[PDB]
């Protein structure tokens, strides 16, 4: 029975600050994050037709990626059914940073029930600008 309850301006701001990289692939992002400290991250366009944006981040010698879902004016990470979401990309990331600070930011390699989760500590956005 239930019913449901500016992205451009944000992305303009994040591009101007440098940490929204626009149309780079997962492989390009891996290169950009190869020599930055663990926890570093960036936002970019997703190559998958089902999504517009992805988060790439460094942890434990690996660059990992996740897609961002955007619906009903809100944002979440993908494959998170039945979540409230956040009203901006920045709010989504800030929430995740706060979870990282508490030891609650973690990932899995499967959504099978019982899949292991692995902690990651996020730090700093990575700028696309050479200085």
């Amino acid at each position: 029975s239930m019913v449901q309850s500016s992205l451009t301006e944000e992305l303009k701001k994040l591009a101007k600050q440098g940490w929204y990289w626009g149309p780079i692939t997962r492989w390009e992002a891996e290169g950009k994050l190869a020599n930055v400290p663990d926890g570093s991250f960036l936002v970019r366009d997703s190559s998958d037709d089902r999504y517009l944006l992805s988060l790439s981040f460094r942890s434990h010698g690996k660059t990992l990626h996740t897609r961002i879902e955007h619906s009903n004016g809100r944002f979440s990470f993908y494959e998170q059914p039945d979540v409230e979401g956040h009203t901006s990309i920045v709010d989504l990331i800030e929430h995740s940073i706060g979870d990282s600070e508490n030891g609650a930011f973690c990932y899995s390699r499967s959504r099978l029930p019982g899949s292991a989760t692995y902690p990651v500590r996020l730090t700093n956005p990575v700028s696309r600008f050479m200085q």
Partner: peptide, 9 residues
């Protein structure tokens, strides 16, 4: 492909 799922909190 190094894509992972963030655990919801």
């Amino acid at each position: 492909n190094n894509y992972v799922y963030i655990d919801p909190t």
